[PDB]
JSON list of C-alpha atoms in Angstrom, two decimals:
[
{"chain": "A", "resi": 1, "resn": "UNK", "atom": "CA", "xyz": [0.03, 0.45, 0.14]},
{"chain": "A", "resi": 2, "resn": "UNK", "atom": "CA", "xyz": [0.73, 3.23, -0.17]},
{"chain": "A", "resi": 3, "resn": "UNK", "atom": "CA", "xyz": [0.92, 4.16, 3.50]},
{"chain": "A", "resi": 4, "resn": "UNK", "atom": "CA", "xyz": [3.57, 1.70, 3.54]},
{"chain": "A", "resi": 5, "resn": "UNK", "atom": "CA", "xyz": [5.94, 3.66, 1.81]},
{"chain": "A", "resi": 6, "resn": "UNK", "atom": "CA", "xyz": [6.19, 5.55, 4.38]},
{"chain": "A", "resi": 7, "resn": "UNK", "atom": "CA", "xyz": [9.62, 6.26, 6.23]},
{"chain": "A", "resi": 8, "resn": "UNK", "atom": "CA", "xyz": [7.34, 7.20, 8.94]},
{"chain": "A", "resi": 9, "resn": "UNK", "atom": "CA", "xyz": [3.67, 7.40, 9.80]},
{"chain": "A", "resi": 10, "resn": "UNK", "atom": "CA", "xyz": [2.17, 8.42, 13.41]},
{"chain": "A", "resi": 11, "resn": "UNK", "atom": "CA", "xyz": [1.14, 5.66, 14.42]},
{"chain": "A", "resi": 12, "resn": "UNK", "atom": "CA", "xyz": [5.24, 4.81, 14.65]},
{"chain": "A", "resi": 13, "resn": "UNK", "atom": "CA", "xyz": [6.05, 8.52, 17.10]},
{"chain": "A", "resi": 14, "resn": "UNK", "atom": "CA", "xyz": [7.16, 7.54, 20.03]},
{"chain": "A", "resi": 15, "resn": "UNK", "atom": "CA", "xyz": [4.80, 10.30, 23.06]},
{"chain": "A", "resi": 16, "resn": "UNK", "atom": "CA", "xyz": [6.97, 9.21, 26.76]},
{"chain": "A", "resi": 17, "resn": "UNK", "atom": "CA", "xyz": [3.59, 9.03, 28.98]},
{"chain": "A", "resi": 18, "resn": "UNK", "atom": "CA", "xyz": [6.01, 9.17, 32.33]},
{"chain": "A", "resi": 19, "resn": "UNK", "atom": "CA", "xyz": [6.83, 12.99, 30.89]},
{"chain": "A", "resi": 20, "resn": "UNK", "atom": "CA", "xyz": [4.31, 15.09, 30.50]},
{"chain": "A", "resi": 21, "resn": "UNK", "atom": "CA", "xyz": [2.96, 13.31, 26.52]},
{"chain": "A", "resi": 22, "resn": "UNK", "atom": "CA", "xyz": [6.77, 13.79, 25.67]},
{"chain": "A", "resi": 23, "resn": "UNK", "atom": "CA", "xyz": [6.88, 13.24, 21.71]},
{"chain": "A", "resi": 24, "resn": "UNK", "atom": "CA", "xyz": [9.59, 13.24, 20.90]},
{"chain": "A", "resi": 25, "resn": "UNK", "atom": "CA", "xyz": [11.39, 15.42, 17.80]},
{"chain": "A", "resi": 26, "resn": "UNK", "atom": "CA", "xyz": [12.98, 13.52, 15.04]},
{"chain": "A", "resi": 27, "resn": "UNK", "atom": "CA", "xyz": [10.53, 10.75, 14.62]},
{"chain": "A", "resi": 28, "resn": "UNK", "atom": "CA", "xyz": [7.68, 13.36, 14.43]},
{"chain": "A", "resi": 29, "resn": "UNK", "atom": "CA", "xyz": [9.50, 15.87, 11.83]},
{"chain": "A", "resi": 30, "resn": "UNK", "atom": "CA", "xyz": [9.66, 12.52, 9.86]},
{"chain": "A", "resi": 31, "resn": "UNK", "atom": "CA", "xyz": [5.89, 11.18, 10.64]},
{"chain": "A", "resi": 32, "resn": "UNK", "atom": "CA", "xyz": [4.92, 15.25, 8.78]},
{"chain": "A", "resi": 33, "resn": "UNK", "atom": "CA", "xyz": [7.25, 14.72, 6.12]},
{"chain": "A", "resi": 34, "resn": "UNK", "atom": "CA", "xyz": [5.71, 11.69, 5.42]},
{"chain": "A", "resi": 35, "resn": "UNK", "atom": "CA", "xyz": [1.81, 12.52, 5.48]},
{"chain": "A", "resi": 36, "resn": "UNK", "atom": "CA", "xyz": [3.60, 15.32, 2.71]},
{"chain": "A", "resi": 37, "resn": "UNK", "atom": "CA", "xyz": [3.90, 12.38, 0.09]},
{"chain": "A", "resi": 38, "resn": "UNK", "atom": "CA", "xyz": [-0.25, 12.51, 0.77]},
{"chain": "A", "resi": 39, "resn": "UNK", "atom": "CA", "xyz": [-0.81, 15.74, -0.77]},
{"chain": "A", "resi": 40, "resn": "UNK", "atom": "CA", "xyz": [1.73, 14.06, -3.46]},
{"chain": "A", "resi": 41, "resn": "UNK", "atom": "CA", "xyz": [-1.61, 11.65, -5.01]},
{"chain": "A", "resi": 42, "resn": "UNK", "atom": "CA", "xyz": [-4.23, 14.04, -3.97]},
{"chain": "A", "resi": 43, "resn": "UNK", "atom": "CA", "xyz": [-3.35, 16.23, -6.51]},
{"chain": "A", "resi": 44, "resn": "UNK", "atom": "CA", "xyz": [0.64, 17.52, -7.07]},
{"chain": "A", "resi": 45, "resn": "UNK", "atom": "CA", "xyz": [0.36, 20.64, -8.63]},
{"chain": "A", "resi": 46, "resn": "UNK", "atom": "CA", "xyz": [-3.26, 21.86, -6.54]},
{"chain": "A", "resi": 47, "resn": "UNK", "atom": "CA", "xyz": [-2.09, 20.82, -3.16]},
{"chain": "A", "resi": 48, "resn": "UNK", "atom": "CA", "xyz": [1.91, 21.56, -3.94]},
{"chain": "A", "resi": 49, "resn": "UNK", "atom": "CA", "xyz": [0.49, 25.01, -2.43]},
{"chain": "A", "resi": 50, "resn": "UNK", "atom": "CA", "xyz": [-0.16, 23.15, 1.16]},
{"chain": "A", "resi": 51, "resn": "UNK", "atom": "CA", "xyz": [3.11, 20.82, 0.54]},
{"chain": "A", "resi": 52, "resn": "UNK", "atom": "CA", "xyz": [5.69, 24.22, 0.52]},
{"chain": "A", "resi": 53, "resn": "UNK", "atom": "CA", "xyz": [3.68, 25.49, 3.82]},
{"chain": "A", "resi": 54, "resn": "UNK", "atom": "CA", "xyz": [4.17, 22.17, 6.01]},
{"chain": "A", "resi": 55, "resn": "UNK", "atom": "CA", "xyz": [7.55, 21.23, 4.56]},
{"chain": "A", "resi": 56, "resn": "UNK", "atom": "CA", "xyz": [8.78, 24.76, 5.36]},
{"chain": "A", "resi": 57, "resn": "UNK", "atom": "CA", "xyz": [7.08, 24.16, 9.18]},
{"chain": "A", "resi": 58, "resn": "UNK", "atom": "CA", "xyz": [8.54, 21.05, 9.13]},
{"chain": "A", "resi": 59, "resn": "UNK", "atom": "CA", "xyz": [11.84, 22.60, 8.62]},
{"chain": "A", "resi": 60, "resn": "UNK", "atom": "CA", "xyz": [12.27, 25.81, 11.21]},
{"chain": "A", "resi": 61, "resn": "UNK", "atom": "CA", "xyz": [11.61, 22.96, 13.20]},
{"chain": "A", "resi": 62, "resn": "UNK", "atom": "CA", "xyz": [14.20, 20.58, 12.64]},
{"chain": "A", "resi": 63, "resn": "UNK", "atom": "CA", "xyz": [16.83, 24.15, 11.93]},
{"chain": "A", "resi": 64, "resn": "UNK", "atom": "CA", "xyz": [16.13, 24.13, 15.42]},
{"chain": "A", "resi": 65, "resn": "UNK", "atom": "CA", "xyz": [16.97, 20.96, 16.43]},
{"chain": "A", "resi": 66, "resn": "UNK", "atom": "CA", "xyz": [19.81, 21.19, 15.32]},
{"chain": "A", "resi": 67, "resn": "UNK", "atom": "CA", "xyz": [21.50, 23.38, 16.73]},
{"chain": "A", "resi": 68, "resn": "UNK", "atom": "CA", "xyz": [20.33, 22.94, 19.88]},
{"chain": "A", "resi": 69, "resn": "UNK", "atom": "CA", "xyz": [20.12, 18.86, 20.26]},
{"chain": "A", "resi": 70, "resn": "UNK", "atom": "CA", "xyz": [20.15, 18.14, 23.50]},
{"chain": "A", "resi": 71, "resn": "UNK", "atom": "CA", "xyz": [17.58, 21.17, 24.51]},
{"chain": "A", "resi": 72, "resn": "UNK", "atom": "CA", "xyz": [15.28, 19.92, 21.12]},
{"chain": "A", "resi": 73, "resn": "UNK", "atom": "CA", "xyz": [14.74, 15.96, 22.02]},
{"chain": "A", "resi": 74, "resn": "UNK", "atom": "CA", "xyz": [11.65, 16.26, 22.56]},
{"chain": "A", "resi": 75, "resn": "UNK", "atom": "CA", "xyz": [9.18, 18.69, 20.81]},
{"chain": "A", "resi": 76, "resn": "UNK", "atom": "CA", "xyz": [7.47, 19.98, 24.07]},
{"chain": "A", "resi": 77, "resn": "UNK", "atom": "CA", "xyz": [11.29, 20.75, 25.67]},
{"chain": "A", "resi": 78, "resn": "UNK", "atom": "CA", "xyz": [11.62, 21.79, 22.17]},
{"chain": "A", "resi": 79, "resn": "UNK", "atom": "CA", "xyz": [9.37, 25.16, 22.48]},
{"chain": "A", "resi": 80, "resn": "UNK", "atom": "CA", "xyz": [10.77, 25.58, 26.43]},
{"chain": "A", "resi": 81, "resn": "UNK", "atom": "CA", "xyz": [14.23, 25.73, 25.31]},
{"chain": "A", "resi": 82, "resn": "UNK", "atom": "CA", "xyz": [13.98, 28.28, 22.28]},
{"chain": "A", "resi": 83, "resn": "UNK", "atom": "CA", "xyz": [11.62, 30.69, 24.19]},
{"chain": "A", "resi": 84, "resn": "UNK", "atom": "CA", "xyz": [14.96, 31.59, 26.18]},
{"chain": "A", "resi": 85, "resn": "UNK", "atom": "CA", "xyz": [16.43, 33.29, 23.48]},
{"chain": "A", "resi": 86, "resn": "UNK", "atom": "CA", "xyz": [13.94, 33.04, 19.07]},
{"chain": "A", "resi": 87, "resn": "UNK", "atom": "CA", "xyz": [10.05, 31.81, 18.29]},
{"chain": "A", "resi": 88, "resn": "UNK", "atom": "CA", "xyz": [10.88, 30.92, 15.05]},
{"chain": "A", "resi": 89, "resn": "UNK", "atom": "CA", "xyz": [10.96, 27.17, 15.63]},
{"chain": "A", "resi": 90, "resn": "UNK", "atom": "CA", "xyz": [7.43, 27.21, 18.31]},
{"chain": "A", "resi": 91, "resn": "UNK", "atom": "CA", "xyz": [5.92, 29.28, 15.63]},
{"chain": "A", "resi": 92, "resn": "UNK", "atom": "CA", "xyz": [6.53, 26.96, 13.35]},
{"chain": "A", "resi": 93, "resn": "UNK", "atom": "CA", "xyz": [5.65, 24.62, 15.02]},
{"chain": "A", "resi": 94, "resn": "UNK", "atom": "CA", "xyz": [2.29, 25.94, 15.94]},
{"chain": "A", "resi": 95, "resn": "UNK", "atom": "CA", "xyz": [1.42, 26.17, 12.27]},
{"chain": "A", "resi": 96, "resn": "UNK", "atom": "CA", "xyz": [2.40, 22.78, 11.65]},
{"chain": "A", "resi": 97, "resn": "UNK", "atom": "CA", "xyz": [-0.39, 20.98, 13.97]},
{"chain": "A", "resi": 98, "resn": "UNK", "atom": "CA", "xyz": [-2.83, 23.65, 12.30]},
{"chain": "A", "resi": 99, "resn": "UNK", "atom": "CA", "xyz": [-1.94, 21.61, 8.42]},
{"chain": "A", "resi": 100, "resn": "UNK", "atom": "CA", "xyz": [-1.52, 18.34, 9.97]},
{"chain": "A", "resi": 101, "resn": "UNK", "atom": "CA", "xyz": [-4.84, 18.98, 11.57]},
{"chain": "A", "resi": 102, "resn": "UNK", "atom": "CA", "xyz": [-6.81, 19.62, 8.42]},
{"chain": "A", "resi": 103, "resn": "UNK", "atom": "CA", "xyz": [-4.98, 16.92, 6.97]},
{"chain": "A", "resi": 104, "resn": "UNK", "atom": "CA", "xyz": [-6.34, 14.91, 9.66]},
{"chain": "A", "resi": 105, "resn": "UNK", "atom": "CA", "xyz": [-9.82, 16.18, 9.71]},
{"chain": "A", "resi": 106, "resn": "UNK", "atom": "CA", "xyz": [-10.90, 15.74, 5.55]},
{"chain": "A", "resi": 107, "resn": "UNK", "atom": "CA", "xyz": [-9.27, 12.23, 5.75]},
{"chain": "A", "resi": 108, "resn": "UNK", "atom": "CA", "xyz": [-11.31, 11.06, 9.01]},
{"chain": "A", "resi": 109, "resn": "UNK", "atom": "CA", "xyz": [-14.31, 12.71, 7.60]},
{"chain": "A", "resi": 110, "resn": "UNK", "atom": "CA", "xyz": [-14.08, 11.26, 4.13]},
{"chain": "A", "resi": 111, "resn": "UNK", "atom": "CA", "xyz": [-13.53, 7.93, 5.81]},
{"chain": "A", "resi": 112, "resn": "UNK", "atom": "CA", "xyz": [-15.90, 7.79, 7.83]},
{"chain": "A", "resi": 113, "resn": "UNK", "atom": "CA", "xyz": [-18.33, 9.13, 5.19]},
{"chain": "A", "resi": 114, "resn": "UNK", "atom": "CA", "xyz": [-19.77, 9.24, 2.11]},
{"chain": "A", "resi": 115, "resn": "UNK", "atom": "CA", "xyz": [-19.09, 13.04, 1.00]},
{"chain": "A", "resi": 116, "resn": "UNK", "atom": "CA", "xyz": [-16.26, 14.27, -1.82]},
{"chain": "A", "resi": 117, "resn": "UNK", "atom": "CA", "xyz": [-13.11, 15.41, -1.03]},
{"chain": "A", "resi": 118, "resn": "UNK", "atom": "CA", "xyz": [-13.09, 18.56, -2.28]},
{"chain": "A", "resi": 119, "resn": "UNK", "atom": "CA", "xyz": [-15.80, 19.34, 0.77]},
{"chain": "A", "resi": 120, "resn": "UNK", "atom": "CA", "xyz": [-14.60, 16.91, 3.04]},
{"chain": "A", "resi": 121, "resn": "UNK", "atom": "CA", "xyz": [-11.49, 19.44, 2.72]},
{"chain": "A", "resi": 122, "resn": "UNK", "atom": "CA", "xyz": [-13.48, 22.46, 3.20]},
{"chain": "A", "resi": 123, "resn": "UNK", "atom": "CA", "xyz": [-15.07, 21.58, 5.16]},
{"chain": "A", "resi": 124, "resn": "UNK", "atom": "CA", "xyz": [-12.03, 20.44, 7.83]},
{"chain": "A", "resi": 125, "resn": "UNK", "atom": "CA", "xyz": [-10.45, 24.08, 6.45]},
{"chain": "A", "resi": 126, "resn": "UNK", "atom": "CA", "xyz": [-13.55, 26.41, 7.18]},
{"chain": "A", "resi": 127, "resn": "UNK", "atom": "CA", "xyz": [-12.66, 24.78, 11.45]},
{"chain": "A", "resi": 128, "resn": "UNK", "atom": "CA", "xyz": [-8.45, 24.69, 10.86]},
{"chain": "A", "resi": 129, "resn": "UNK", "atom": "CA", "xyz": [-6.87, 27.38, 8.70]},
{"chain": "A", "resi": 130, "resn": "UNK", "atom": "CA", "xyz": [-9.20, 29.91, 7.54]},
{"chain": "A", "resi": 131, "resn": "UNK", "atom": "CA", "xyz": [-9.73, 31.78, 10.61]},
{"chain": "A", "resi": 132, "resn": "UNK", "atom": "CA", "xyz": [-5.98, 32.28, 10.68]},
{"chain": "A", "resi": 133, "resn": "UNK", "atom": "CA", "xyz": [-5.78, 32.92, 6.77]},
{"chain": "A", "resi": 134, "resn": "UNK", "atom": "CA", "xyz": [-5.11, 36.05, 5.01]},
{"chain": "A", "resi": 135, "resn": "UNK", "atom": "CA", "xyz": [-7.39, 37.72, 2.87]},
{"chain": "A", "resi": 136, "resn": "UNK", "atom": "CA", "xyz": [-4.57, 36.61, -0.07]},
{"chain": "A", "resi": 137, "resn": "UNK", "atom": "CA", "xyz": [-3.56, 32.98, 1.35]},
{"chain": "A", "resi": 138, "resn": "UNK", "atom": "CA", "xyz": [-7.39, 31.71, 1.44]},
{"chain": "A", "resi": 139, "resn": "UNK", "atom": "CA", "xyz": [-8.00, 31.59, -2.14]},
{"chain": "A", "resi": 140, "resn": "UNK", "atom": "CA", "xyz": [-4.62, 29.88, -2.96]},
{"chain": "A", "resi": 141, "resn": "UNK", "atom": "CA", "xyz": [-6.09, 26.51, -0.51]},
{"chain": "A", "resi": 142, "resn": "UNK", "atom": "CA", "xyz": [-9.50, 27.36, -0.99]},
{"chain": "A", "resi": 143, "resn": "UNK", "atom": "CA", "xyz": [-8.17, 26.90, -5.34]},
{"chain": "A", "resi": 144, "resn": "UNK", "atom": "CA", "xyz": [-6.35, 23.38, -4.28]},
{"chain": "A", "resi": 145, "resn": "UNK", "atom": "CA", "xyz": [-9.69, 22.25, -2.35]},
{"chain": "A", "resi": 146, "resn": "UNK", "atom": "CA", "xyz": [-12.14, 22.32, -5.55]},
{"chain": "A", "resi": 147, "resn": "UNK", "atom": "CA", "xyz": [-8.68, 20.81, -7.25]},
{"chain": "A", "resi": 148, "resn": "UNK", "atom": "CA", "xyz": [-9.34, 16.89, -5.79]},
{"chain": "A", "resi": 149, "resn": "UNK", "atom": "CA", "xyz": [-9.07, 13.76, -7.17]},
{"chain": "A", "resi": 150, "resn": "UNK", "atom": "CA", "xyz": [-12.53, 12.00, -7.33]},
{"chain": "A", "resi": 151, "resn": "UNK", "atom": "CA", "xyz": [-12.90, 9.95, -3.69]},
{"chain": "A", "resi": 152, "resn": "UNK", "atom": "CA", "xyz": [-12.76, 6.41, -5.56]},
{"chain": "A", "resi": 153, "resn": "UNK", "atom": "CA", "xyz": [-9.08, 7.88, -7.82]},
{"chain": "A", "resi": 154, "resn": "UNK", "atom": "CA", "xyz": [-8.25, 7.97, -4.66]},
{"chain": "A", "resi": 155, "resn": "UNK", "atom": "CA", "xyz": [-8.77, 4.94, -2.38]},
{"chain": "A", "resi": 156, "resn": "UNK", "atom": "CA", "xyz": [-7.36, 3.10, -5.54]},
{"chain": "A", "resi": 157, "resn": "UNK", "atom": "CA", "xyz": [-4.46, 5.41, -6.21]},
{"chain": "A", "resi": 158, "resn": "UNK", "atom": "CA", "xyz": [-3.84, 3.97, -2.43]},
{"chain": "A", "resi": 159, "resn": "UNK", "atom": "CA", "xyz": [-4.17, 0.10, -2.85]},
{"chain": "A", "resi": 160, "resn": "UNK", "atom": "CA", "xyz": [-4.96, -2.32, -3.88]},
{"chain": "A", "resi": 161, "resn": "UNK", "atom": "CA", "xyz": [-7.49, -4.14, -1.18]},
{"chain": "A", "resi": 162, "resn": "UNK", "atom": "CA", "xyz": [-10.12, -1.19, -0.33]},
{"chain": "A", "resi": 163, "resn": "UNK", "atom": "CA", "xyz": [-10.68, -3.36, 3.19]},
{"chain": "A", "resi": 164, "resn": "UNK", "atom": "CA", "xyz": [-6.55, -3.85, 4.22]},
{"chain": "A", "resi": 165, "resn": "UNK", "atom": "CA", "xyz": [-6.66, 0.74, 3.02]},
{"chain": "A", "resi": 166, "resn": "UNK", "atom": "CA", "xyz": [-8.92, 1.41, 5.04]},
{"chain": "A", "resi": 167, "resn": "UNK", "atom": "CA", "xyz": [-8.19, 0.30, 8.54]},
{"chain": "A", "resi": 168, "resn": "UNK", "atom": "CA", "xyz": [-4.69, 1.19, 7.92]},
{"chain": "A", "resi": 169, "resn": "UNK", "atom": "CA", "xyz": [-5.96, 4.59, 7.42]},
{"chain": "A", "resi": 170, "resn": "UNK", "atom": "CA", "xyz": [-8.29, 4.69, 10.26]},
{"chain": "A", "resi": 171, "resn": "UNK", "atom": "CA", "xyz": [-5.03, 3.33, 11.59]},
{"chain": "A", "resi": 172, "resn": "UNK", "atom": "CA", "xyz": [-3.30, 6.79, 10.91]},
{"chain": "A", "resi": 173, "resn": "UNK", "atom": "CA", "xyz": [-5.72, 8.91, 11.38]},
{"chain": "A", "resi": 174, "resn": "UNK", "atom": "CA", "xyz": [-6.65, 8.29, 14.67]},
{"chain": "A", "resi": 175, "resn": "UNK", "atom": "CA", "xyz": [-2.09, 8.32, 16.34]},
{"chain": "A", "resi": 176, "resn": "UNK", "atom": "CA", "xyz": [-1.97, 12.16, 14.17]},
{"chain": "A", "resi": 177, "resn": "UNK", "atom": "CA", "xyz": [-4.56, 12.95, 16.19]},
{"chain": "A", "resi": 178, "resn": "UNK", "atom": "CA", "xyz": [-3.88, 11.67, 19.06]},
{"chain": "A", "resi": 179, "resn": "UNK", "atom": "CA", "xyz": [-0.59, 13.30, 18.34]},
{"chain": "A", "resi": 180, "resn": "UNK", "atom": "CA", "xyz": [-2.34, 16.76, 17.11]},
{"chain": "A", "resi": 181, "resn": "UNK", "atom": "CA", "xyz": [-4.90, 16.92, 20.23]},
{"chain": "A", "resi": 182, "resn": "UNK", "atom": "CA", "xyz": [-1.40, 16.23, 22.76]},
{"chain": "A", "resi": 183, "resn": "UNK", "atom": "CA", "xyz": [0.05, 19.33, 20.99]},
{"chain": "A", "resi": 184, "resn": "UNK", "atom": "CA", "xyz": [-2.37, 21.84, 20.42]},
{"chain": "A", "resi": 185, "resn": "UNK", "atom": "CA", "xyz": [-3.22, 21.69, 24.78]},
{"chain": "A", "resi": 186, "resn": "UNK", "atom": "CA", "xyz": [0.99, 21.81, 24.59]},
{"chain": "A", "resi": 187, "resn": "UNK", "atom": "CA", "xyz": [-0.01, 24.94, 22.33]},
{"chain": "A", "resi": 188, "resn": "UNK", "atom": "CA", "xyz": [-2.87, 26.15, 23.75]},
{"chain": "A", "resi": 189, "resn": "UNK", "atom": "CA", "xyz": [-0.66, 26.72, 28.04]},
{"chain": "A", "resi": 190, "resn": "UNK", "atom": "CA", "xyz": [1.54, 29.91, 28.68]},
{"chain": "A", "resi": 191, "resn": "UNK", "atom": "CA", "xyz": [3.97, 27.10, 28.16]},
{"chain": "A", "resi": 192, "resn": "UNK", "atom": "CA", "xyz": [4.09, 27.88, 24.73]},
{"chain": "A", "resi": 193, "resn": "UNK", "atom": "CA", "xyz": [2.63, 31.40, 24.16]},
{"chain": "A", "resi": 194, "resn": "UNK", "atom": "CA", "xyz": [5.58, 33.75, 23.78]}
]
């Protein structure tokens, strides 16, 4: 299946429940980068702005990790220790998590309904990224989502066995949603404000 091509799944990103659901930085960034390959499946050209945006935010985080590695081993510590300085990686995390949630809601909505892909994406956009985007960025996202493939064509690209693709994508989305929820709670805390 397409999902088995992933360098890193969100299923395999470590979470340290004893240290406040510490999300391991390296595996998380690799998982975010793998998820961007799904934009190519959906519409290489159409979703290139979303991929580019997401990859830029990943890179902001990676830059900081590399510059301060012992202080940046999990996402929460990475943020705590940058916020004595620069908020570049922290701000990158904010926007990455919004992009991950946009993708997560859209796909979860679509697989749990018969809606067309374009509408699952539109409804997700409304509740994730749209309120934070400028008047010039909204039309970029709107044009991209209108160019979604027909849902049948999308899932066929994910593998030949409809049942296996669905079970595996659900497991993936559940794991992503868990990580999104943890990081959103972290980001809304005073700990993460600059």
